[PDB]
Every structure is written in C-alpha cells, then in structure tokens.
Ligand binder design. Structure first.
Ligand SMILES: *[C@@H]1O[C@H](CO)[C@@H](O)[C@H](O)[C@H]1NC(C)=O
Ligand SMILES: *[C@@H]1O[C@H](CO)[C@@H](O)[C@H](O)[C@H]1NC(C)=O
Lengths: 303, 303
C-alpha cells in the first residue's frame, strides 16, 4: 500500500502532518518504520487502526485530539520504540503499550490519576514525559511506577504539591519543575540515590530541610530557582559532585561563608562550575569573596 | 558537551521538548544528529546559535514563536536534510538554508510573500509544506520556485484565489486544498505535466474548464470535493490513469452517462478504484447504471 492522500513518504517513512485527518488513514505500507501524523484531527484509536505495522519503530501522534484508545490498539506494534502522544485529550495513561517502547511522550494531556500496573509490562522504558497534565499528588497511586527500571522522568507543569516518593529508584534524571511543591523534606529524595539532575525550579519551595539533599551522593546539577527559599539549602558543601546549583529568583536574604564550599579542603569534592544567585534580596557587597573559593571562573557565578 | 538541562538525549539524539526554553540552548554536542526542540519559547535564531553542529541532520523547531532568523544562522549546518519550523511567527521564507536540505516544513506561519531567489540555492528539496500561511496569489512572485526540481508541494490553507502557474514542473504531488480558488481554467495545470495527485478539496471552484485536466496525462488521484462544482468536470474519461476522483459535497446536479467511462471502452485502459458523489443534489436514481460501467466493485462508488 503506497501512502494516504495528503501524505508523502519515502523509504519506509510516512509523513502525514497538518492535513487535519479525521482518523489514521487506511492505506499504510507495512514496511513502514516512522509514522509522523502530527496536528490532524484523530479523536480515537481503533483496534485495527495500526494493523500489521509490526515494523513501526517511532509513532508521532502529537497535536491531535485523541480521547479514546481501544485496548488492542497498540498490540500489532511489536517493534515500536517511540510513542509521542503529546497535546491531546487523553484521560488515562494508555495500557498495553508495546514492551519494545523506550521513550513515551504524553505532555499536555488531561490525565488526572495514574493507577498501578499501568507500566507493569514495559521493561525498556527510560524516558517519560508526563507534564502539562493535571495531577495532584493524590492522583498517583501506590506502586504506579512499580517494577519499571527507567532513567529519565519528567512530571513538570502539573499539580504536584510535594515531591513524589514511590518513583523508580533507577532514575538518573528527575524533573518536577513548574509545580506547586511546598517544601523538600527529609525522606523525599530518599530512594532516588543515583541522580544526575534534579530540577525543582519554578516551585513554591519555602523550606528544604537539611540532610534531605544528602541521599544524592552523585547529584551533579541542582536547579532550585524560582522558589520561596529563605537561605542557601543545607547540605550543599557535603555533595561531593555538585557542579552547578541554581538559586536565582528566591528569597535568600543571607549567604553564610560556608554555604557552598566545605570547611576543610578535600578532593572527593568538585569545584562549582555554575552558581546563580542574582535576583535575591542580598547585594554583592554583603557576600564575602571567600564564599565562592571553590568555584572556578568568575564567569561561573551569575550574581 | 553533555546536553541542556530539561533535555534528555541518547546516542546523538538531543530531545529538548516542552521545556519552554527562552532560546536554543548553548550546551549541544557536535556529535548530535537530531535536535528536537519543539514547543519552547524560542524567539529568534542567532548567528552562532547552532555553531558547530555539522552533523545535525534534522532540526525540529516546531511550535515555538520564532520571528527573526539571523542570516548566517543555518550556515553551520552542512549536512542538515530536514528542517521543521511550522507553527511559528516567521514572516518570510528563511534564506541560506543548507543545500543538503530535502524536506522543509514551514506551516502555520505569517509569511505574506515569497520573493524570487529564495530557493535558488537548494538542489535537493522535494518536500515543501507552506500551508497555514496568509498569502494571496499576488504574494507569489515571478520565478519564486525558480530552479527547484522538487516533487511534493503543499500550499494548503492559504489565501489562494487561483491555481499558481510558475511552480516546479518536476512536481509529482501538489495540494492546494482549503483555499479560496475560484475556478480551474485552461492553462492552469499546463506545465504540471507529471502529477499523480492533485488535491483541490475545500475550495470555491465553480467551473473547471474543459481540456484543462488534459495536461495531466498520468493523474491517478484527484480530490475535487467540497466546491461549488455544478457538473462532473469535463475530461475525466480521457485521463488514462485516473483511478480515484472525489466529487462529494459539491453542487453537481446532473450526471451524464459518459462522464466517467470513455465512449469506446478498450483493453489497455483503467478502472476507477473509487468515486465519491454523496452530498450532491442528484439522487442515485437519476443517474443511469450504464454510467459506472468501467468502475470495478459497487463499493468503489460512495453514492
Ligand atoms: C521573602 O521575605 C521573607 C524573607 O525575609 C520570606 O520569609 C517570605 O516568604 C518572602 N515574601 C513573600 C511572601 O514572597
Ligand atoms: C448550486 O445551484 C445552482 C445550480 O445551477 C448553481 O447555479 C449555484 O452556483 C449553486 N448554489 C450554491 C451556492 O450552492
């Protein structure tokens, strides 16, 4: 089967975008590897909508208005690894997705609660966009990300009121930027013991209670800007590899001299490679230079 | 350089999406081949915005608010073959796009005119999305597509009042659906002598002039639905390869018996593989059976 009317496709790639297609076209070669059918008018996925696309690797469904997805919709998709279904009217993480899947974009939707065994099948995940969704911490559910060894996860722009606890432990990155988070407590970041990044920018963090940032032996970048913070978060010096913390647009008033570098020189340590602080009530002349001894360049200090 | 904060990226693929970045991020490994940075807040492209991404193959800038693109902006892109910058505030077709480029999606923009030497450079195009722009026929300019052997071309959803005549002759597909096109006259499709499809759906074609559809020896699919037509366009039977004509939602009143099949049915000829007629003032009972002799099934006759 060559390709649907508006579409143009070449060598197993099928490009069907901005045609405003009522649903997934019926003429689609099985040879087909990518199906980019973005910004059309699909409102559901039907059992046999994707029938016999077993060689389909990446399906881009973004910018549609999907809202119902038939159970055995994805089941013919044996080799599928990429499923981008951002900016849709989805109302539940779709089930039965292809164990082959490694990336899952599902931003700007309408998912209010993520149940339990939803991700139970996948065993290759590692990327998961779920922001732009309206979920409150009470929407997650005991063992939602149960058995799911994945390294990236972003739940930005949602209705998070505090950092979730039962996420994947394997997580190498964790984002939660753009929420309504209240404050990072002691055992929040507990089990996330392998993180490189940790965005919490644009939140409402008022009081990060010390030692909580301790369980992140390897944390490398910490964005903690645009909050309601009042002093530099306690634990910063003890983080052997924190190379860029981000604190601008907070409500830091005072900057202790040992608020970043540690008291007695080490080497397990790393020199900061970026520190933000501008746009905080505390002028340049209130913070002794001795304060940024272990940063490298001057240029590393937005201030 | 490992990748920008919100971004995840693996094996030369940099995924920066929905982070709402103010601009194209600075830390981008030259090893990078896909640069997906969709739905952010990019407002312009700066000289050195992309410096040293010579292995960048496809760049995805869709759903951002771009409005100024520096001249030398794309020059660092020796091997770039896909550029999708649809859904942006662009005000003119960007110049000095990489000669390597094969596909250019520039939909939903604000480009009011396309001047002459714009595509002069490229020699590998074949896919151009320019719909969702506001351009009248007066907006094009003599020799705009000058020297541009390309095979696809979709100017949907614009302000076309008639079919443009100085498009690429090498054209295989050509879409002009959703316009305000008035009528397809004699020499309109003159030089497009190599088309397989020709969408003119959703227009205001009142009167397609005979012979005009004669210049398309190979035309295989012709949507011509959603217009002000009043009788089946003259010439249909003479198109040796027309397999699917769409006529629905028009204003076709009478259907001559030899409007579809030719008068002296050969052996070498073609069967229609689909004809639409539904939603037109003319009941199934006014149109003689002898009329669809050469169609194949009954089911190829939405009617
Ligand atoms: C900043 O003012 C103080 C720091 O002295 C802090 O307690 C408070 O949360 C901030 N004010 C508001 C409501 O933004
Ligand atoms: C269809 O009806 C008449 C038939 O002659 C035609 O003159 C006219 O253009 C059409 N009316 C509309 C606006 O549908």
């Amino acid at each position: 089967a060559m390709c649907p009317f508006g579409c143009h496709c070449h060598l197993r790639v099928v490009q069907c975008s901005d045609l405003g297609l009522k649903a997934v076209p019926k003429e689609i070669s099985p040879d087909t590897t990518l199906l980019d059918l973005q910004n059309n008018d699909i409102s559901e996925l039907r059992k046999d909508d994707f029938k016999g696309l077993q060689h389909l690797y990446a399906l881009v469904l973004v910018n549609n208005k999907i809202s119902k997805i038939h159970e055995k919709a994805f089941s013919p998709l044996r080799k599928l690894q990429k499923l981008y279904i951002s900016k849709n009217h989805l109302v539940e993480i779709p089930p039965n997705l292809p164990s082959s899947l490694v990336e899952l974009r599902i931003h700007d939707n309408r998912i209010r609660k993520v149940p339990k065994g939803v991700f139970s099948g996948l065993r290759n995940m590692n990327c998961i966009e779920m922001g732009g969704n309206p979920l409150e911490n009470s929407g997650f559910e005991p063992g939602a990300f149960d058995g799911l060894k994945l390294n990236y996860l972003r739940i930005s722009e949602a209705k998070l009121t505090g950092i979730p606890k039962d996420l994947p432990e394997t997580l190498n990155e964790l984002h939660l930027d753009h929420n309504k988070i209240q404050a990072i407590e002691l055992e929040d970041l507990l089990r996330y013991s392998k993180l490189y990044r940790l965005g919490l920018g644009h939140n409402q963090i008022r009081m990060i209670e010390n030692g909580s940032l301790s369980f992140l032996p390897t944390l490398r970048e910490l964005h903690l800007d645009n909050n309601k913070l009042s002093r530099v978060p306690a634990g910063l010096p003890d983080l052997k590899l924190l190379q860029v913390v981000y604190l601008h647009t907070n409500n830091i008033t005072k900057v202790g001299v040992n608020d970043f570098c540690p008291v007695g020189f080490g080497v397990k340590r790393a020199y900061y490679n970026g520190i933000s602080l501008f746009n905080n009530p505390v002028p340049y002349w209130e913070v002794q230079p001795a304060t940024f001894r272990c940063v490298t360049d001057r240029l590393a200090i937005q201030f």
